[PDB]
Write a protein that binds this DNA or RNA. Structure first.
Ligand SMILES: [Mg+2]
Ligand SMILES: [Mg+2]
Length: 342
DNA sequence: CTAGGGTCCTAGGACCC
DNA sequence: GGGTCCTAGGACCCT
């Protein structure tokens, strides 16, 4: 009863699209991200820029210190969405059991496939080749018996490669696997785990489940399971979007309500247009606002509300401004809706 | 020197039974 | 005294 899970993941996705569409960018360091003047971060970078230490989520001023010749690009999201749609259609030639996790990646359950004589290894290779042949972009892939190991595997032979983990290979693989490599174990958790002497799955294997449950709740059960290669999460092709948000960080902090209100007047038409794409009648479950202050504390206030409404978002932002700001400057203003359930 | 798009989990009081 | 809803916050994910 062992499943075959593929995780397909595009290489340097945004940057690879830009180099395909402008070959001049192929061999110089580039990154998609907000400018230093816009107080931006790097969304991603190509390998020439990564060589300097440029990484996703790096503050753009830091990227430019490591890599002074970095070429900064704004991003063409319709181009990325187009490539995303194309690779998802390519996935569908092989199975309907597709769970996209973001624009550039997806799980595939090919357990019941008899493409490529049932070889998940050859299916992954054929998908990667097809993506290259039809989009001129490269992808990497991971093959394993459960989701999380497949996702880990797709990172290990990047770029333009793949890695297969068989059931026989799972124990040796897990023994020295850093906990931080597990999707969902981030910096904070890995630092907590590190401070109690838990660095790898092999370390967690020597732990009591009951202790982990006390110390971490349901996360502790996940940690205990994953550290044993256990991951029964099914590939789910039926997930739906639950929220829509529009937010912007300004280049300078704001200190006046008039400025906040003026920002909202610019955010609102964009929120309306994006909601209308998925809900033409604008009917929603909740709407609300977000402020981020100059000390990086952020607050949200959202409430049951039946239909996108600009004046109520302004009014709510006014309360948040007056009630929770405490005189600090504001670097970000955001609008948000929660979508109706079905 | 710190984005913007999101998902999920937690947790207290409200409300219900 | 248990479920669920309302709400806020925060870790984490992707590029
Ligand atoms: Mg990728
Ligand atoms: Mg990805």
């Amino acid at each position: 009863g062992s499943r075959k899970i593929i995780h397909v993941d595009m290489d340097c996705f945004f940057a690879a699209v830009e180099m395909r569409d402008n070959p001049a960018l192929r061999d110089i360091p580039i990154a998609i991200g907000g400018s230093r003047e816009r107080r931006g971060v790097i969304s991603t970078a190509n390998y020439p820029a990564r060589k300097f230490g440029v990484r996703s989520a790096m503050p753009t001023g830091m990227a430019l210190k490591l890599c002074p010749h970095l070429t900064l690009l704004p991003g063409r999201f319709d181009a990325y969405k187009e490539a995303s749609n194309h690779i998802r259609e390519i996935f569908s030639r092989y199975t309907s059991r597709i769970e996209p996790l973001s624009l550039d990646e997806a799980y595939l359950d090919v357990t019941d496939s008899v493409h490529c004589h049932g070889s998940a290894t050859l299916i992954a290779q054929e998908i990667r080749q097809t993506i290259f042949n039809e989009l001129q972009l490269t992808a990497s892939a991971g093959v394993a018996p459960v989701k999380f190991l497949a996702k880990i595997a797709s990172d290990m032979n990047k770029p333009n490669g793949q890695f297969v983990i068989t059931p026989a290979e799972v124990p040796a693989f897990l023994q020295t696997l850093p906990l931080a490599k597990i999707p969902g174990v981030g910096k904070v958790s890995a630092a907590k785990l590190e401070a109690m002497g838990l660095r790898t799955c092999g370390d967690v294997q020597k732990c009591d489940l009951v202790m982990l449950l006390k110390r971490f709740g349901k996360f502790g059960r996940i940690l205990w399971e994953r550290s044993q290669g256990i991951d029964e999460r099914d590939v789910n092709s039926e997930r739906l979007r639950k929220s829509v948000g529009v937010e912007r960080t300004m280049a300078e902090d704001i200190h006046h309500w008039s400025e906040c209100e003026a920002i909202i007047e610019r955010l609102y038409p964009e929120l309306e247009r994006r909601l209308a794409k998925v809900k033409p009648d604008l009917l929603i479950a909740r709407q609300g606002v977000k402020l981020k202050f100059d000390d990086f504390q952020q607050t949200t206030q959202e409430h049951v509300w039946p239909r996108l409404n600009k004046a109520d978002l302004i009014a709510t932002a006014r309360k948040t401004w007056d009630e929770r700001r405490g005189g600090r400057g504001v670097r970000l203003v955001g609008l948000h809706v929660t979508l109706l359930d079905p």
